[PDB]
Structure 1
């Protein structure tokens, strides 16, 4: 619930005076479990039925 600030870089790899507050998705849980379930099923939608 405590959210730092992240700079906004230029076209040259250099800071600018603007600073954005880090939005709350980057504090959310890290669950490679649920990724590994959802990635396993959403990869399957892609496929064609493949010869019969």
Structure 2
């Protein structure tokens, strides 16, 4: 679908921060090796 999930953000220690970004629609753009 055009579903944009909630992509977390990681602190330098390797643990997940409480601040989260909606996956930009760039990442669901058509996968074209051509």
TM-score, scaled to structure 2: 0.86
Structure 1's consecutive aligned runs of 4 or more residues displaced over 6 angstroms after TM superposition are: none
Q: Which has the higher contact order (CA 8 A, sep 6+)?
A: 2
Alpha carbon RMSD of aligned pairs, Å?
0.6
- Which ranges in structure 2 are unaligned for 5 or more consecutive residues? none
TM-score, scaled to structure 1: 0.60
Instruction: Give the number of aligned pairs.
Output: 33
Task: Say which structure is richer in strand.
Answer: 2
